[PDB]
Amino acid sequence: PAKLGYWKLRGLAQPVRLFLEYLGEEYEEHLYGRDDREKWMSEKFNMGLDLPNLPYYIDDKCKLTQSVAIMRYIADKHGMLGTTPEERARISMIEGAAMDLRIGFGRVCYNPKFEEVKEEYVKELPKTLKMWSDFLGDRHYLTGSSVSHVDFMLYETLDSIRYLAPHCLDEFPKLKEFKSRIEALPKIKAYMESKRFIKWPLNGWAASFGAGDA
Amino acid sequence: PAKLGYWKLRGLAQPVRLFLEYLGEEYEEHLYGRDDREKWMSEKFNMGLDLPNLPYYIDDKCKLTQSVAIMRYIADKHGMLGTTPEERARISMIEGAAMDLRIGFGRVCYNPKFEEVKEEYVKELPKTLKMWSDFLGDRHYLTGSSVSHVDFMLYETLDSIRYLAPHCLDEFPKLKEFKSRIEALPKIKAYMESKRFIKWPLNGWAASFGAGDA
Numbered sequence: 502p503a504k505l506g507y508w509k510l511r512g513l514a515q516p517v518r519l520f521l522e523y524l525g526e527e528y529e530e531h532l533y534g535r536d537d538r539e540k541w542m543s544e545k546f547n548m549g550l551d552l553p554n555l556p557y558y559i560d561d562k563c564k565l566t567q568s569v570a571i572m573r574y575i576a577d578k579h580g581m582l583g584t585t586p587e588e589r590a591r592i593s594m595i596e597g598a599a600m601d602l603r604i605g606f607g608r609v610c611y612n613p614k615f616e617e618v619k620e621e622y623v624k625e626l627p628k629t630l631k632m633w634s635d636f637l638g639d640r641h642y643l644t645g646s647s648v649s650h651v652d653f654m655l656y657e658t659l660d661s662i663r664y665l666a667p668h669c670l671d672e673f674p675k676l677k678e679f680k681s682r683i684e685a686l687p688k689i690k691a692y693m694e695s696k697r698f699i700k701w702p703l704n705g706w707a708a709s710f711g712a713g714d715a
Numbered sequence: 716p717a718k719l720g721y722w723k724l725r726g727l728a729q730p731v732r733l734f735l736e737y738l739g740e741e742y743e744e745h746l747y748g749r750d751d752r753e754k755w756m757s758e759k760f761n762m763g764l765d766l767p768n769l770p771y772y773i774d775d776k777c778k779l780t781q782s783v784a785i786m787r788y789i790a791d792k793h794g795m796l797g798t799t800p801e802e803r804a805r806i807s808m809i810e811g812a813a814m815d816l817r818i819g820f821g822r823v824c825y826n827p828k829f830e831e832v833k834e835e836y837v838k839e840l841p842k843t844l845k846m847w848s849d850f851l852g853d854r855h856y857l858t859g860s861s862v863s864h865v866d867f868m869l870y871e872t873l874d875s876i877r878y879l880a881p882h883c884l885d886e887f888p889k890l891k892e893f894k895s896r897i898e899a900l901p902k903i904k905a906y907m908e909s910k911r912f913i914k915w916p917l918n919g920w921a922a923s924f925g926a927g928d929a
């Protein structure tokens with residue numbers, strides 16, 4: 502059974518964990534916590550990761566790091582990243598704007614004074630989701646008609662704002678229907694109820710928004 | 716001739732512009748400026764980019780966006796992103812820590828009070844470059860022995876700190892020799908002197924560090 506490390510936090514281990522349940526890989530999970538930043542620290546340089554970090558992926562064959570890198574290569578195992586250079590480019594281009602989001606926000610989800618930086622950024626939040634949904638146009642999923650790794654990227658970001666921007670999450674139609682579809686899919690849906698799902702937090706205890714223990 | 720859009724700024728168009736000169740693609744350049752955020756704004760939704768942004772790449776075949784996405788697909792044209800899923804994963808994993816840098820800093824390069832956030836982060840700066848160079852181990856280039864797209868990513872970030880952390884840029888041996896090698900390579904080196912090279916700034920006029928007109 503593979504292995505996905507990270508602390509009990511939706512952090513950036515959600516899409517990657519979701520992507521595994523969707524593609525039912527019997528993986529193991531290496532959870533972390535607050536009582537364990539040090540419990541982790543000392544280990545950060547043992548599992549031997551060319552570029553240590555979290556979430557880390559341990560395989561009998563590969564030892565990768567980087568949420569995305571820990572997804573991309575797990576997509577090749579199922580050859581999902583397309584085939585033709587053209588189309589193979591549209592898959593990454595998306596994860597580009599899939600991190601553009603979480604990144605442009607992640608920096609602001611642990612700092613005390615996020616609020617100030619939060620206050621006016623919502624001016625652009627509809628804008629980003631203006632082209633994000635406009636782009637979602639009318640298709641079933643991000644890249645066409647079949648759930649690809651990038652789709653859970655953009656999903657966990659939405660259900661992420663569903664906790665501090667619902668007023669605007671509803672502001673956009675298409676993207677609204679979206680959230681439900683992923684929540685619809687088979688084991689994904691069942692996962693969203695299983696004994697091994699991470700509900701709260703969604704950013705990490707040590708933070709003001711989306712953070713917290715319970 | 717292809718096309719790479721961005722304002723006269725090393726921004727995130729340097730590695731991608733460098734990667735093209737290395738692989739001598741006869742590209743065109745769509746420069747932007749301060750007198751042109753609006754000159755750009757109005758155009759942001761015309762060249763038809765599923766997910767508008769900068770730097771944008773215009774081809775007769777593909778219209779991509781995202782510095783990296785604008786690089787990856789331009790690597791497939793030269794099939795450089797490896798071949799075996801295993802090795803093909805090590806290429807992205809790197810660009811992961813190639814953005815980890817510029818990102819963990821980019822957020823801090825335009826804000827007035829970066830200094831405060833700059834002050835103590837340098838505590839980790841050696842750490843990151845501790846495993847960044849340790850990883851660079853003893854090989855010619857990041858991914859083995861041949862300059863891949865990820866190599867200019869990590870190069871422009873170093874020559875980026877060469878302007879506000881030299882004290883520490885020297886702190887690390889390996890990575891130190893590095894900067895010179897890229898500067899060594901053929902047309903890359905010649906590019907670092909050509910009539911079409913971007914010297915200053917390296918982050919964007921509207922900013923305190925690395926920014927500025929002249």
Ligand SMILES: N[C@H](CCC(=O)N[C@@H](CS)C(=O)NCC(=O)O)C(=O)O
Nearest residue numbers: 545554555556566567568569811815
């Ligand atoms: N962009 C992230 C880079 C990693 C990252 O910054 N890791 C965080 C999550 S916010 C971690 O928990 N850091 C622990 C560490 O510094 O050792 C990725 O692709 O994994």
Ligand SMILES: N[C@H](CCC(=O)N[C@@H](CS)C(=O)NCC(=O)O)C(=O)O
Nearest residue numbers: 597601759768769770780781782783
């Ligand atoms: N991570 C960047 C996302 C884009 C980005 O944030 N673009 C900036 C550069 S700092 C741009 O100049 N923005 C113009 C815009 O908002 O239209 C990428 O891959 O291109």
